[PDB]
Amino acid sequence: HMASMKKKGSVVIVGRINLSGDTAYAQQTRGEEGCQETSQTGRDKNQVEGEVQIVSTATQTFLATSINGVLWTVYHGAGTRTIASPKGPVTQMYTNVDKDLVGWQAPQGSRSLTPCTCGSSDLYLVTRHADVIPVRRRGDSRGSLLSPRPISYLKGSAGGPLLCPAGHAVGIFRAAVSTRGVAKAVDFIPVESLETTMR
């Protein structure tokens, strides 16, 4: 049994959500074959740019967001996996199954969002398809969608950011709250929880 035991691959950056300009849009930087190879080696020589990465395992594609020099995502997507990097696989710097949170050192080339200090409740969720959806904050870890969507619309957005009007990071999207397939609210990991994890 031992000789044939497999290893899980690395998480692989396969694109980004470009927020650098007037228009939000998803860009793909690696196709499926390159992703599969890179997951195996853990060696990714692609140049990273931006705050929000699109990331993949063998089974899921989701998001990861840089805040304070850490690339954050959800445990339910990444598990305990390494992330591929120019120098080989990079081990998680944070792992917290209870928070549904993991982090790696932010890749060179990435830009980080700053944690929000505004203490305000009018937010914006960035999805894996680069939609920017208004969300009213309803508690420390929940927000309501101003316009409800089918859950399919949010699938694969876990790990992406909720932002304040000034563009600071307020949280990391975790899960939709749904009834009969329709999302009217979102659960997120508040940035203060990340800040506690960091300090």
């Binding site: 339910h76 949010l154 899960a175 939709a176 749904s178 009834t179």
Partner: peptide, 6 residues
């Protein structure tokens, strides 16, 4: 209900 990890 309910909830669904995304």
């Amino acid at each position: 209900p309910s909830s669904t990890p995304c």
